[PDB]
Design an enzyme around this catalytic site. Structure first.
Site, PDB file in Angstrom:
ATOM      1  N   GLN A  62      12.675   1.269 -52.743  1.00 22.95           N
ATOM      2  CA  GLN A  62      13.535   1.171 -51.573  1.00 22.95           C
ATOM      3  C   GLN A  62      13.363  -0.143 -50.811  1.00 22.95           C
ATOM      4  O   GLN A  62      14.210  -1.028 -50.906  1.00 22.95           O
ATOM      5  CB  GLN A  62      13.304   2.359 -50.631  1.00 22.95           C
ATOM      6  CG  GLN A  62      14.217   2.358 -49.394  1.00 22.95           C
ATOM      7  CD  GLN A  62      14.100   3.630 -48.562  1.00 22.95           C
ATOM      8  OE1 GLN A  62      13.359   4.554 -48.911  1.00 22.95           O
ATOM      9  NE2 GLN A  62      14.828   3.678 -47.453  1.00 22.95           N
ATOM     10  N   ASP A  63      12.268  -0.233 -50.054  1.00 19.85           N
ATOM     11  CA  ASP A  63      12.003  -1.320 -49.117  1.00 19.85           C
ATOM     12  C   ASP A  63      10.700  -1.981 -49.574  1.00 19.85           C
ATOM     13  O   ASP A  63       9.789  -1.281 -49.994  1.00 19.85           O
ATOM     14  CB  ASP A  63      11.789  -0.721 -47.713  1.00 19.85           C
ATOM     15  CG  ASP A  63      12.254  -1.641 -46.593  1.00 19.85           C
ATOM     16  OD1 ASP A  63      13.415  -2.093 -46.624  1.00 19.85           O
ATOM     17  OD2 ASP A  63      11.472  -1.873 -45.647  1.00 19.85           O
ATOM     18  N   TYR A  65       6.967  -3.746 -49.187  1.00 20.90           N
ATOM     19  CA  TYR A  65       5.860  -3.575 -48.241  1.00 20.90           C
ATOM     20  C   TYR A  65       6.092  -4.498 -47.049  1.00 20.90           C
ATOM     21  O   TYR A  65       6.544  -5.627 -47.225  1.00 20.90           O
ATOM     22  CB  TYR A  65       4.522  -3.951 -48.883  1.00 20.90           C
ATOM     23  CG  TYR A  65       4.000  -2.988 -49.932  1.00 20.90           C
ATOM     24  CD1 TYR A  65       3.643  -1.683 -49.593  1.00 20.90           C
ATOM     25  CD2 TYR A  65       3.827  -3.399 -51.255  1.00 20.90           C
ATOM     26  CE1 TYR A  65       3.147  -0.806 -50.545  1.00 20.90           C
ATOM     27  CE2 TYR A  65       3.322  -2.530 -52.224  1.00 20.90           C
ATOM     28  CZ  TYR A  65       2.982  -1.238 -51.860  1.00 20.90           C
ATOM     29  OH  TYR A  65       2.482  -0.365 -52.805  1.00 20.90           O
ATOM     30  N   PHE A  76       6.119  -1.731 -55.347  1.00 25.40           N
ATOM     31  CA  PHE A  76       4.801  -1.056 -55.331  1.00 25.40           C
ATOM     32  C   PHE A  76       3.588  -1.956 -55.558  1.00 25.40           C
ATOM     33  O   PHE A  76       2.452  -1.552 -55.274  1.00 25.40           O
ATOM     34  CB  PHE A  76       4.760   0.153 -56.280  1.00 25.40           C
ATOM     35  CG  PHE A  76       5.747   1.229 -55.924  1.00 25.40           C
ATOM     36  CD1 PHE A  76       6.884   1.414 -56.689  1.00 25.40           C
ATOM     37  CD2 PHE A  76       5.531   2.057 -54.814  1.00 25.40           C
ATOM     38  CE1 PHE A  76       7.812   2.415 -56.360  1.00 25.40           C
ATOM     39  CE2 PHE A  76       6.451   3.058 -54.469  1.00 25.40           C
ATOM     40  CZ  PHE A  76       7.592   3.240 -55.247  1.00 25.40           C
ATOM     41  N   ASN A 122      13.154  -3.150 -56.086  1.00 30.03           N
ATOM     42  CA  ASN A 122      13.490  -2.544 -54.798  1.00 30.03           C
ATOM     43  C   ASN A 122      14.982  -2.708 -54.509  1.00 30.03           C
ATOM     44  O   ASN A 122      15.593  -3.701 -54.908  1.00 30.03           O
ATOM     45  CB  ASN A 122      12.676  -3.167 -53.662  1.00 30.03           C
ATOM     46  CG  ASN A 122      11.260  -2.610 -53.579  1.00 30.03           C
ATOM     47  OD1 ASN A 122      11.034  -1.419 -53.792  1.00 30.03           O
ATOM     48  ND2 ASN A 122      10.307  -3.472 -53.259  1.00 30.03           N
ATOM     49  N   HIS A 186       8.696  10.977 -54.364  1.00 23.82           N
ATOM     50  CA  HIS A 186       8.084   9.683 -54.088  1.00 23.82           C
ATOM     51  C   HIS A 186       6.545   9.811 -54.114  1.00 23.82           C
ATOM     52  O   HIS A 186       6.015  10.831 -53.683  1.00 23.82           O
ATOM     53  CB  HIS A 186       8.562   9.180 -52.725  1.00 23.82           C
ATOM     54  CG  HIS A 186       8.207   7.758 -52.445  1.00 23.82           C
ATOM     55  ND1 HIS A 186       6.936   7.368 -52.079  1.00 23.82           N
ATOM     56  CD2 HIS A 186       8.951   6.630 -52.485  1.00 23.82           C
ATOM     57  CE1 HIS A 186       6.915   6.061 -51.901  1.00 23.82           C
ATOM     58  NE2 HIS A 186       8.125   5.588 -52.143  1.00 23.82           N
ATOM     59  N   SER A 188       4.189   8.421 -52.338  1.00 25.78           N
ATOM     60  CA  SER A 188       3.470   8.359 -51.050  1.00 25.78           C
ATOM     61  C   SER A 188       2.776   9.685 -50.757  1.00 25.78           C
ATOM     62  O   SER A 188       3.280  10.732 -51.139  1.00 25.78           O
ATOM     63  CB  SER A 188       4.406   7.948 -49.913  1.00 25.78           C
ATOM     64  OG  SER A 188       5.405   8.924 -49.687  1.00 25.78           O
ATOM     65  N   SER A 191       4.686  12.928 -49.823  1.00 25.97           N
ATOM     66  CA  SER A 191       5.587  13.578 -50.778  1.00 25.97           C
ATOM     67  C   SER A 191       4.991  13.792 -52.173  1.00 25.97           C
ATOM     68  O   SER A 191       5.594  14.466 -53.016  1.00 25.97           O
ATOM     69  CB  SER A 191       6.887  12.768 -50.892  1.00 25.97           C
ATOM     70  OG  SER A 191       6.608  11.412 -51.196  1.00 25.97           O
TER      71      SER A 191
HETATM   72  O1  LIG Z   1       9.410  10.269 -44.048  1.00 29.54           O
HETATM   73  C1  LIG Z   1       9.586  10.833 -45.093  1.00 29.54           C
HETATM   74  O2  LIG Z   1      10.186  12.015 -45.161  1.00 29.54           O
HETATM   75  C2  LIG Z   1       9.129  10.217 -46.381  1.00 29.54           C
HETATM   76  C3  LIG Z   1       8.155  10.871 -47.128  1.00 29.54           C
HETATM   77  C4  LIG Z   1       7.722  10.326 -48.335  1.00 29.54           C
HETATM   78  C5  LIG Z   1       8.268   9.129 -48.797  1.00 29.54           C
HETATM   79  C6  LIG Z   1       9.247   8.478 -48.051  1.00 29.54           C
HETATM   80  C7  LIG Z   1       9.822   7.178 -48.561  1.00 29.54           C
HETATM   81  N1  LIG Z   1       9.232   6.071 -47.831  1.00 29.54           N
HETATM   82  C8  LIG Z   1       7.849   5.699 -48.037  1.00 29.54           C
HETATM   83  C9  LIG Z   1       7.564   4.308 -47.488  1.00 29.54           C
HETATM   84  C10 LIG Z   1       6.151   3.856 -47.817  1.00 29.54           C
HETATM   85  C11 LIG Z   1       6.074   3.408 -49.271  1.00 29.54           C
HETATM   86  N2  LIG Z   1       5.987   1.999 -49.400  1.00 29.54           N
HETATM   87  C12 LIG Z   1       5.642   1.722 -50.747  1.00 29.54           C
HETATM   88  C13 LIG Z   1       6.803   1.038 -51.431  1.00 29.54           C
HETATM   89  C14 LIG Z   1       6.666  -0.269 -51.878  1.00 29.54           C
HETATM   90  C15 LIG Z   1       7.758  -0.855 -52.507  1.00 29.54           C
HETATM   91  O3  LIG Z   1       7.687  -2.027 -52.924  1.00 29.54           O
HETATM   92  N3  LIG Z   1       8.898  -0.156 -52.656  1.00 29.54           N
HETATM   93  C16 LIG Z   1       9.003   1.106 -52.216  1.00 29.54           C
HETATM   94  O4  LIG Z   1      10.078   1.726 -52.366  1.00 29.54           O
HETATM   95  N4  LIG Z   1       7.963   1.698 -51.607  1.00 29.54           N
HETATM   96  C17 LIG Z   1       9.682   9.021 -46.839  1.00 29.54           C
END
Ligand SMILES: O=C(O)c1cccc(CNCCCCNCc2cc(=O)[nH]c(=O)[nH]2)c1
Length: 222
Positions: A62-63, A65, A76, A122, A186, A188, A191
């Site tokens: 997605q986004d 860091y 990532f 991303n 995801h 993280s 999740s």
């Molecule tokens: O608030 C929520 O409901 C939620 C829960 C779990 C995952 C998410 C998705 N966002 C997580 C953001 C932190 C990752 N950053 C790591 C990352 C690095 C990258 O380069 N690309 C990426 O997509 N992600 C959102």
């Protein structure tokens, strides 16, 4: 150069489009007033690691860091000596249980996968320092959709790994008769136990690759 030539040959049709010029202007203006990640020479690292024709696997993020020294243009991934962030530690944890012989490299630099044809893309390719989603819906989405669309139409038997609802939406239109789509939560910590732990995407990818007569990824080659 900052943009790989094999990618440019196929994606250059986007560059003169109204949205793309606007996007470039937006990012440029942001860089004048803010610290924007990744650095200017690392926005398109994902074009630099292999030829577009050699892509085997696509991991959609997605986004980037948003902390100092983290984003370097591969989703990532973090360069040495930056500690792997929680999402990446969870990826390595899943690798360790999915593939017994996987070895943790002791760093977070995923360049080794990129070189093997794992596209680490991303959806949004810049972010303002410390501000998640600050560059959302400014044109990156259309550009990265174009990358996904090209691969969808012009390659054969890719494995797309869609982690989280955002990536699932981005890969919704991928041709499932031509390519393979694996979906889970995801990585993280929030999740990860909603499916990612136990998803076994890495072994599954390699078996799908072998089904198309392709050599598998060595996930420990990092
Ligand atoms: O608030 C929520 O409901 C939620 C829960 C779990 C995952 C998410 C998705 N966002 C997580 C953001 C932190 C990752 N950053 C790591 C990352 C690095 C990258 O380069 N690309 C990426 O997509 N992600 C959102």
């Amino acid at each position: 150069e900052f943009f790989g030539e094999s990618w440019k040959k196929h994606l250059s049709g986007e560059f003169g489009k109204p949205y793309f010029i606007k996007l470039m202007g937006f990012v440029a203006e942001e860089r004048k007033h803010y610290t924007v990640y990744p650095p200017p020479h690392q926005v398109f690292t994902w074009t630099q690691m292999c030829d577009i024709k050699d892509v085997k696997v696509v991991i959609l993020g997605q986004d980037p860091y948003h902390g100092p020294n983290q984003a370097h243009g591969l989703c990532f991934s973090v360069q040495r000596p930056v500690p792997p962030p929680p999402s990446l530690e969870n990826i390595y944890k899943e690798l360790s249980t999915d593939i017994e012989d996987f070895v943790h490299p002791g760093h977070g630099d995923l360049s080794g996968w990129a070189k093997q044809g794992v596209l680490l893309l991303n959806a949004v390719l810049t972010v303002r320092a410390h501000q998640a989603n600050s560059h959302k819906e400014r044109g990156w989405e259309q550009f990265t959709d174009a990358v996904v669309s090209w691969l969808n139409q012009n390659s054969n038997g890719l494995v797309f790994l869609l982690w989280g609802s955002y990536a699932q939406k981005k890969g919704s239109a991928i041709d499932r008769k031509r390519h393979h789509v694996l979906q889970t939560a995801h990585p993280s910590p929030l999740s990860v136990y909603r499916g990612f732990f136990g998803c076994r995407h890495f072994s599954k990818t390699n078996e799908l690759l072998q089904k198309s007569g392709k050599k598998p990824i060595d996930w420990k080659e990092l």
